[PDB]
Amino acid sequence: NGMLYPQSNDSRIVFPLDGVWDFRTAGEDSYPAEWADAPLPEPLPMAVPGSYNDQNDELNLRAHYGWVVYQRSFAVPSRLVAGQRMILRFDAATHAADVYLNGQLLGSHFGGFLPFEFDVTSALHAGENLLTVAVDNRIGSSTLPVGNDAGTAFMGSDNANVPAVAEAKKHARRQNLPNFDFFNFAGLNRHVELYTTPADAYIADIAITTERLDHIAGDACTAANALIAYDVTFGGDGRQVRISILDGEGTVVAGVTADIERTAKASGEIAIRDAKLWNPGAAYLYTAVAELLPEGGAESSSRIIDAYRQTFGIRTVEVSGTTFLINGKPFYFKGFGKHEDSYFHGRGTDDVLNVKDVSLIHWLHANSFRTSHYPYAESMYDLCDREGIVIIDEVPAVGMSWLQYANPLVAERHREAIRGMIARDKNHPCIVMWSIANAPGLDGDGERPRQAYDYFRPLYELAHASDPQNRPVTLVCCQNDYTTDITERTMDVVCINRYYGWYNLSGDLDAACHALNIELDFWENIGKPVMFTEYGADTIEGIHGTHGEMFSEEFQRDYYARINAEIDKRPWFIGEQLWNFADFATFQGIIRVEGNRKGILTRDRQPKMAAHWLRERWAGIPDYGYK
Amino acid sequence: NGMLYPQSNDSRIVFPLDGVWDFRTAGEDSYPAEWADAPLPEPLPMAVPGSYNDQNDELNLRAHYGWVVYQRSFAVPSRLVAGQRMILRFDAATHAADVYLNGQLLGSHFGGFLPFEFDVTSALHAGENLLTVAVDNRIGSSTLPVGNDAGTAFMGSDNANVPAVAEAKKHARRQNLPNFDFFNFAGLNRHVELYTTPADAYIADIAITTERLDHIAGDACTAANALIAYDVTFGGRQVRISILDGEGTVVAGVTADIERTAKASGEIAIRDAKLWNPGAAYLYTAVAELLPEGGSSRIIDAYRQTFGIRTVEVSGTTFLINGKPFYFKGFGKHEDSYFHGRGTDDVLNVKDVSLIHWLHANSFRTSHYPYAESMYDLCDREGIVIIDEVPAVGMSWLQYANPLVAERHREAIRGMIARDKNHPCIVMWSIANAPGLDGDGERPRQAYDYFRPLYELAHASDPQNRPVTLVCCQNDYTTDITERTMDVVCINRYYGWYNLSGDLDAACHALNIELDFWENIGKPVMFTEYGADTIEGIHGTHGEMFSEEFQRDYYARINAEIDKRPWFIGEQLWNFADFATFQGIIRVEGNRKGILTRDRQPKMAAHWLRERWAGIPDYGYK
Ligand SMILES: O=C(O)[C@H]1O[C@@H](Oc2cc3ccccc3oc2=O)[C@H](O)[C@@H](O)[C@@H]1O
Numbered sequence A: 001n002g003m004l005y006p007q008s009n010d011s012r013i014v015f016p017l018d019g020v021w022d023f024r025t026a027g028e029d030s031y032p033a034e035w036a037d038a039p040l041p042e043p044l045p046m047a048v049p050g051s052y053n054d055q056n057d058e059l060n061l062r063a064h065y066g067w068v069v070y071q072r073s074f075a076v077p078s079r080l081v082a083g084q085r086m087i088l089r090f091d092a093a094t095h096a097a098d099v100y101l102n103g104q105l106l107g108s109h110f111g112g113f114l115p116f117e118f119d120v121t122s123a124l125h126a127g128e129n130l131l132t133v134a135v136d137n138r139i140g141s142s143t144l145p146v147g148n149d150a151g152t153a154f155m156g157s158d159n160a161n162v163p164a165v166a167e168a169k170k171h172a173r174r175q176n177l178p179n180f181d182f183f184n185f186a187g188l189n190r191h192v193e194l195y196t197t198p199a200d201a202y203i204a205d206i207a208i209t210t211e212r213l214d215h216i217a218g219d220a221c222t223a224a225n226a227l228i229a230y231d232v233t234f235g236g237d238g239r240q241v242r243i244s245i246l247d248g249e250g251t252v253v254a255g256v257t258a259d260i261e262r263t264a265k266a267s268g269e270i271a272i273r274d275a276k277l278w279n280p281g282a283a284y285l286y287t288a289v290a291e292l293l294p295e296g297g298a299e300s301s302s303r304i305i306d307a308y309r310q311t312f313g314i315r316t317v318e319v320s321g322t323t324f325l326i327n328g329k330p331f332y333f334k335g336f337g338k339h340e341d342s343y344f345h346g347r348g349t350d351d352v353l354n355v356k357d358v359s360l361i362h363w364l365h366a367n368s369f370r371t372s373h374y375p376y377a378e379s380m381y382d383l384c385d386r387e388g389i390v391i392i393d394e395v396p397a398v399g400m401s402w403l404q405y406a407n408p409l410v411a412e413r414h415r416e417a418i419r420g421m422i423a424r425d426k427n428h429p430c431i432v433m434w435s436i437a438n439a440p441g442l443d444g445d446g447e448r449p450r451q452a453y454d455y456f457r458p459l460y461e462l463a464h465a466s467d468p469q470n471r472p473v474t475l476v477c478c479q480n481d482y483t484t485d486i487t488e489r490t491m492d493v494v495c496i497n498r499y500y501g502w503y504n505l506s507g508d509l510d511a512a513c514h515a516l517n518i519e520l521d522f523w524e525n526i527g528k529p530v531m532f533t534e535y536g537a538d539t540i541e542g543i544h545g546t547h548g549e550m551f552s553e554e555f556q557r558d559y560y561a562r563i564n565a566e567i568d569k570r571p572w573f574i575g576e577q578l579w580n581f582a583d584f585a586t587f588q589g590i591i592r593v594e595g596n597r598k599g600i601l602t603r604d605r606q607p608k609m610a611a612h613w614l615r616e617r618w619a620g621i622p623d624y625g626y627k
Numbered sequence B: 001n002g003m004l005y006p007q008s009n010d011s012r013i014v015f016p017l018d019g020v021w022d023f024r025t026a027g028e029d030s031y032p033a034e035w036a037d038a039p040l041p042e043p044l045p046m047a048v049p050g051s052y053n054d055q056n057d058e059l060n061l062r063a064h065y066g067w068v069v070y071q072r073s074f075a076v077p078s079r080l081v082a083g084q085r086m087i088l089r090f091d092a093a094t095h096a097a098d099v100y101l102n103g104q105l106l107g108s109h110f111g112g113f114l115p116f117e118f119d120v121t122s123a124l125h126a127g128e129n130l131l132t133v134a135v136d137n138r139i140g141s142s143t144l145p146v147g148n149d150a151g152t153a154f155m156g157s158d159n160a161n162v163p164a165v166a167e168a169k170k171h172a173r174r175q176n177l178p179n180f181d182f183f184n185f186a187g188l189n190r191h192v193e194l195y196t197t198p199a200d201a202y203i204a205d206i207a208i209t210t211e212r213l214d215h216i217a218g219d220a221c222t223a224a225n226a227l228i229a230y231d232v233t234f235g236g237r238q239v240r241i242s243i244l245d246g247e248g249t250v251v252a253g254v255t256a257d258i259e260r261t262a263k264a265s266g267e268i269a270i271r272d273a274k275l276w277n278p279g280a281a282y283l284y285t286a287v288a289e290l291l292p293e294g295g296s297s298r299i300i301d302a303y304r305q306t307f308g309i310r311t312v313e314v315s316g317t318t319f320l321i322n323g324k325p326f327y328f329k330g331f332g333k334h335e336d337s338y339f340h341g342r343g344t345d346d347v348l349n350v351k352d353v354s355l356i357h358w359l360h361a362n363s364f365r366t367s368h369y370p371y372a373e374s375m376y377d378l379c380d381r382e383g384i385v386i387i388d389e390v391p392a393v394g395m396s397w398l399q400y401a402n403p404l405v406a407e408r409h410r411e412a413i414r415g416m417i418a419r420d421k422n423h424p425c426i427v428m429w430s431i432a433n434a435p436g437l438d439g440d441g442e443r444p445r446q447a448y449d450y451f452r453p454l455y456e457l458a459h460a461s462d463p464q465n466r467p468v469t470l471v472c473c474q475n476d477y478t479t480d481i482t483e484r485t486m487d488v489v490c491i492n493r494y495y496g497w498y499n500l501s502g503d504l505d506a507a508c509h510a511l512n513i514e515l516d517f518w519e520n521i522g523k524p525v526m527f528t529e530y531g532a533d534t535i536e537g538i539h540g541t542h543g544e545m546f547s548e549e550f551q552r553d554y555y556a557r558i559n560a561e562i563d564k565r566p567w568f569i570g571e572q573l574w575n576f577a578d579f580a581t582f583q584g585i586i587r588v589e590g591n592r593k594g595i596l597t598r599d600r601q602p603k604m605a606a607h608w609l610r611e612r613w614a615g616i617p618d619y620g621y622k
């Protein structure tokens, strides 16, 4: 179950396989088997990592439906593979992939936003190796994220009662129809790499938890004592593992040698005196170095069999009444939902962009975001660990309704996504909360609200069982009839998406604020902490008015000014994450002006009027103690 | 010299001639005179008032050089012309016109921004009359505004040393090359109307002045006594002068003797007078009624002249309105809009005045030509102060020696002041924009010798004797010897835009060095231009030139510096709104230094300035 990010050290090496690959589009329902067994005929170039859709303007790959096939060759010195365990890792292949090496299927995966890997020790050979990866972009009623098997995309226009329209639909070209509001970018969206570990015995997983903090300082920078726990899992086959705790300067401040017991694990606790805590706006990271010792322990030899360096931060998270406590201090979220989205790359990971976006989060005086609507690339979490930005980590369970709740295949994929996200991400101190879905159907009459609850409650429990830190769990709720939804109010933090004054009461900020206050009165009675995870207004940079109407920069600024003045009056409202950080691509349609334009930044990360207004507001709101 | 705006009353009627006229383009240096003798052949439609250039997308009338010909027919009842003096008034024909009625040349005019009229009493006849108006758009080294006879337009790019360029220039299509930074919009830009007066004796001109205020209230809303003067000129005995307040109540009145050349003049004391102020307009009406011999109750002629009671005085480094130290907040404007060009549009004037209030500004300058008369009436009623400017833009030493230019300059000054003298909203005259004033050898003295008589002329022409300025281009202020002699120093400066580009620290340092120079000069000083081209929608976290943020940052930094100077009495920025120019490599669909877009939408800087100006009082800021 461990998926530690590949590391290079004295016992391990990583060989990236990124670069310009060969590529062919394939069929709507299948691809040629022979393409895995020999070089692709007449290949196109395709950079990896990246979405494929915007990498070829001769083709219309945004319209592609079905399979594509990637391929490349590689060779490595025999000297480096000898005696080692060889693993091929795919950080993400969106949505489903079949991976072949030298004409043999290594295996398959479903789930477009989480990593998977194969043991290729026996499949590799000397000299050039031929790696082929078939990737399927199709979405439908059984995928996460969810597609529509017929009709229109989410937020699509129709005239379904016109006989000519009904007839033309029957014969129209097959297309993915997202039941979600972001473009279905597909392909090898994240890195590919070959890596090595020792074969006889190796470190397979590490979990670090902050179990307890004693006498936390007034400023939350330190605690008199921190109790941390480690759990190390091994693969392979009186053995021991040395655990060293390094502080921010790399000095060993704690260390223990633990017995490995059988499935093989070592676990224990370590007390850290005068512990330096991790906080939003004030990151501090330690490293847990795990070193597998040879048979005979340190008593017999100085050599190290295997090693892995796991970053971690010491901090607690606790929901208490209507507060969200980090290191016992009442936190207030400032930020937004994001997307992994950019020109050229699509959903492809881009660390230049991640580094820039983290600086923009600081420029705005924001302190947090949500990984709307899928787990992000691993590097972004490491960056937010070092930069003191809090994350709500969310699985790709977007577009769901009652059709999905009855389907065992969907429930299995949903559990896989929750387990996989938490297994990948559990050691990040920046992650303070898990989201098990975005905007599923929860309300209505008859049995529908109960059916939704019965689907989601076990997933809430799974997210708690899976996280060794036991962080809060939420479900991000779409604008709905909050009085018949019986699921959202059971979450640990209530996370609501609301578009009062945009999708309803349009343009009327007085009415919008009145409606918002009626719903806030409902949440006030429930007595849980509540935050916005979405609210906003599509905004075309450069459209201006003295009395700003919808789509103007002024309306977007006025929107936030009015709504935020209302939530400031509620002590139990513990965060404001708006929609969205930046404009992003969507399926085309009559309400999407070259995608979603609710960004406070443009797609090129330039600030609209509302961004300047929010920057000034957020400059004056502290991370702790605002409420 | 009186040019009272036409009025309808019991003794006078106005017959508007606006509408869709017939139109033809003509030649570079000529037009067919015979077109005045018959309907124009194969005419195009052309709305009047309006520039013609943007009224026909099949043609490229922005490229037109030379003459066009307008024409229409009209008829009026014989009973109404009978016994009357009939006057045909052109509010503006840009730049020069030959006017014919029924094939008879009435005369011509040069000067594209001031009204002119003809007595058509004898040329009119019963039934349909045919009015033909040839309009010349050409500009050059002897016109105001100034054109270039060769080379490029102002701030145009060139590669003059490339032989192919030099040769191609010799054979290129003739084009007006403005030596000014706005498009050369031409045609019947303002209204046309026929009007009547009595023929035997009539009112030709009226001047009302505020001579003295006694015991002005602390809030300047009133004075214990105001002494006003009237001067009424007649064409073609007694005149009754009645002073009506804001409710139409006659609060003062005198009957004055007419003496010959025929004029009546005197003074009237108004106790507890209600004063006109920026942000708090109050208007009276002086009604002049020509009485019959000798004498009966009946009225021979009448005219109703709006005015406001207020004084204007420069005192040391202060600009006093009703004895209170005023601070200018505002901008240069243009008469410029999509479709209309330089054409007057009162929907746009009403909207723009509301935007001036929305911004919390209190003033503007008529850059760079007198505006339509209706805009001044609007600013009279809306309490917005005006600096009134003649079209003497683009001038340099080439012009100062040209007698035709000098005569046209004197004509514009006399004509502007004769037309506009009664507006209380006008507090200062500008005799030029951005002429060449600095340099070495004899050049600075040559400029002074040209402009000083025009300064004196503006003072001699205005019965209110308001301050006179000359709006100065960014220049070597140490060798300019003319600007510092004006009543108010009005400077155009672009530190950080056209120089020290993008570096606001350096721009502010340079500005402060020049402010130190003006501090020593000891006159009141204001900005009349400063700004940055800005494309709405271009944004940056660290705003660079052309972004909305840079424009906002520009004003935030520069205004913080002038706030430190007690003698700096106003900030008029460039510009109220984006406007059209001749095309070139520094004009992105015109001049983009507007704080509003050309469609009057607010850029980031407009919101910032609105908040700043909201906190600055009209009186007492310094
Ligand atoms: O609409 C968006 O910009 C985002 O919408 C979110 O879901 C919601 C959509 C609608 C539509 C109509 C009326 C109310 C709604 O309230 C919502 O909460 C979605 O989570 C985002 O991914 C979309 O981009």
Ligand SMILES: O=C(O)[C@H]1O[C@@H](Oc2cc3ccccc3oc2=O)[C@H](O)[C@@H](O)[C@@H]1O
Pocket (backbone or CB within 6 Å): B180, B181, B182, B368, B433, B434, B472, B473, B474, B492, B493, B494, B498, B529, B574, B591, B593
């Ligand atoms: O440039 C403008 O936007 C306005 O320029 C004014 O005259 C000046 C132009 C320049 C050019 C280069 C360096 C300094 C300058 O300083 C000026 O004062 C002119 O009055 C306006 O009409 C222009 O639109």
